[PDB]
């Protein structure tokens, strides 16, 4: 599913991402924009053989099981395919664990390089939330 911008903002808010670990909703929408272009089916293979999945490009090296990342962890205790669903629940619950790790939203490279320090509130401007 390719979410609309406000459609994704509302779903992320309903699932409790807004201000989760102090990161306003605009930060999460911006991250999803540059990680996946709001496409839940986005995937990208990393050089080490792990794969990033879904709207927030969550990595199988640590966070989900895809059966093809030897020696990896599954810290969100989910199949990586659950991160590709039209329903973002699994991606949100797993992102809450990731952002709780030492480096906050810097875990998302596209957030650090394209969202951090910018006017992130613009990503939710015009939305009815
Ligand atoms: Cl915001
Ligand atoms: Cl594996
Ligand atoms: Na894994």
Swiss-Prot record:
Catalyzed reactions per annotation: Hydrolysis of (1->4)-beta-linkages between N-acetylmuramic acid and N-acetyl-D-glucosamine residues in a peptidoglycan and between N-acetyl-D-glucosamine residues in chitodextrins
Binding locations of substrate: 101
Molecular function as annotated in GO: beta-N-acetylglucosaminidase activity; identical protein binding; lysozyme activity
Keyword field contains Ubl conjugation: no
InterPro entries to which the protein is assigned, alphabetical: Glyco_hydro_22 (IPR001916), Glyco_hydro_22_CS (IPR019799), Glyco_hydro_22_lys (IPR000974), Lysozyme-like_dom_sf (IPR023346)
PANTHER family: LYSOZYME C
Record-given protein name: Lysozyme C
Organism expressing this protein natively: Gallus gallus (Chicken)
Gene name, Swiss-Prot/TrEMBL: LYZ
